[PDB]
């Protein structure tokens, strides 16, 4: 493998990350004028959906720790947790629409996240995309699901965590997908490896989907289905991080 053989899957991966940042900016639009429409029932129903794109390139939305905390805190980041007049984004509006069935002081909150989600797509457009800090996020990214976001703290009030894992999940394997075939070449066996794994925990999360197709709230997973979602994912995070050495990425 040679860095020529990677200049094209970062290419592909750059057009994946800028659709995804097209539809949050859509999307979040409709949102955030449902918010300040004052149309709760509206907003809370387009909460998850929104956000998957947003989860889909997380690792990219994390180089801008001021932005990405601006979009995506969690009140516990924050000294006055929800009473925290720093606290914004997709959570303090959840927290609104959610525990509250309120939509009341979110017009501005609103506001501040679509100029953040505008303001995201913006500097990541003219960003240069190193294949190992997309690999390597990947990585970090399944292991910070398995070991920080598995008790549900994501989304405290909505509960719409399989929503969100679902979408890393599915941004982790479009990174595996658009290397196979470099990776097929040599490490065919590997890489059939890494596609059952993701096969596994797209399984796993199979089990909580409702009668409409739809998503149980997270509290519907028992302790040791937590338990055992971490441990499948962490082969997730093993599998991205043997990739990185595959691709010659660790010189």
């Known amino acids: 493998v ?11 991966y750059k057009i994946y990350v800028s659709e995804n ?4 900016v859509r999307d979040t639009r409709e949102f955030t ?11 809370k129903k387009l909460f998850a959906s929104t956000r998957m794109s947003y989860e889909r390139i997380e690792p990219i939305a994390e180089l801008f720790s001021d932005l990405d905390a601006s979009i995506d805190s969690r009140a516990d980041d924050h000294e006055k947790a929800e009473k925290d007049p720093a606290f914004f984004g997709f959570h303090r509006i959840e ?8 939509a009341k002081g979110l017009a501005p909150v609103a506001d501040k996240l679509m100029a953040d989600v505008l303001e995201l797509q913006k500097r990541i457009r003219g960003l240069t995309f190193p ?3 997309v690999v390597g996020g990947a990585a970090v990214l399944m292991e910070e699901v398995a070991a920080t976001k598995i008790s549900g703290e994501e989304d405290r009030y909505s509960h719409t965590d399989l929503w969100d894992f679902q979408a890393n999940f599915e941004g982790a ?8 075939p470099l990776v097929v070449k040599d490490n065919r066996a590997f890489a059939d490896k890494v596609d059952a ?20 709230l997270y ?17 997730l995070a093993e599998d991205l991080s043997k990739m990185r050495g595959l691709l010659g990425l660790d010189l």
């Open 33 to 43: 004028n449902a918010v300040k429409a004052g149309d709760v029932a509206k907003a």
């Open 219 to 235: 509290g519907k997973l028992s302790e040791r289905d937590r338990k055992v979602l971490a441990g499948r994912v962490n082969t």
């Open 21 to 24: 940042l097209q539809t949050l």
């Open 95 to 102: 927290y609104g629409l959610f525990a509250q069935n309120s």
């Open 2 to 12: 040679a860095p020529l053989d990677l200049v094209q899957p970062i290419s592909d």
């Open 197 to 216: 794994n993701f096969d596994t925990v797209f399984k796993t999360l199979a089990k909580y989907r409702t009668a409409d197709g739809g998503f149980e």
């Open 131 to 133: 294949p190992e800090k």
């Open 173 to 180: 394997k479009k990174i595996v997908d658009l290397f196979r």
